[PDB]
């Protein structure tokens, strides 16, 4: 049993809700919150910009030190950093950004990072300002992630479409 409330069970291991991931994280304090990161960990907008703002920019400060030491992530890759006031840990995952021309096949590799964590609160990867089809992202999630994932979807009309079209 866990404290995630009002989630729609899609499969054995994937759950979804129309909710603000910032508020879900503040309320649940999950072991892992996933960030929709880029390779430079520059948390400018979307999920990344939103989570960073909720940490009062502490996520960005930590991220800048990470990049200065380690260099950029790979598209499809990830790193584990602090969850600050939102979670124990933040798993920064880089899905492909279609608005940068990145290959959508890398979306499966991106979701594979979730399998290293037994339970996660996460956004649908490559949705919103990353420009990929969210119905596609949800399908890849269900077909790739085997651990227990709670997807928080910000946009109500996207959530309604994701529920209505899920096979």
Ligand X SMILES: O=C(N[C@H]1c2cccc(O)c2C[C@H]1C(=O)O)c1ccc(NCC2CC2)nc1
Find the angle CA(41)-CA(37)-CA(18) to the nearest 5 degrees: 145
Binding pattern for the stretch 39-78 against ligand X, x by CB under 6 A and - elsewhere: -------xx--x----------------------------
Near ligand X by CB under 6 A: residue from 114, 123, 141, 162: 123
Near ligand X by CB under 6 A: residue from 25, 32, 124, 141: 124
CB-neighbour burial class of residue 43 (10 A; exposed 0-12, middle 13-18, buried 19+) = buried
Rounded Cα distance between 96 and 101, Å, is: 8
Using CB under 6 A, which residues numbered 11 to 40 contact ligand X? 20-22, 36
Rounded Cα distance between 77 and 38, Å, is: 10
Note whether 133 binds ligand X by CB under 6 A.
no
Residues at the contact surface with ligand X, assessed by CB under 6 A: 20-22, 36, 46-47, 50, 123-130, 153-155, 158
């Amino acid at each position: 049993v866990n404290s995630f409330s009002g989630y729609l069970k899609l499969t054995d291991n994937v759950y979804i809700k129309n909710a603000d991931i910032v508020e879900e994280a503040k309320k649940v304090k999950p072991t892992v919150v996933v960030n929709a990161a880029n390779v430079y960990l520059k948390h400018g907008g979307g999920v990344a910009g939103a989570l960073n703002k909720a940490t009062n920019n502490a996520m960005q400060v930590e991220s800048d030190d990470y990049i200065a030491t380690n260099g950029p992530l790979k598209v499809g890759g990830s790193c584990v950093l602090s969850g600050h006031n939102l979670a124990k840990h933040c798993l920064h995952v880089v899905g492909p950004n279609v608005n940068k021309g990145e290959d959508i096949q890398l979306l499966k590799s991106a979701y594979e990072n979730f399998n290293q964590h037994e339970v996660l609160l996460a956004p649908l990867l490559s949705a919103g300002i990353f420009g990929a089809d969210p119905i596609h992202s949800l399908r890849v999630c269900v077909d790739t992630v085997r651990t227990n994932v709670y997807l928080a979807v910000f946009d109500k009309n996207l959530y309604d479409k994701l529920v209505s079209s899920f096979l």
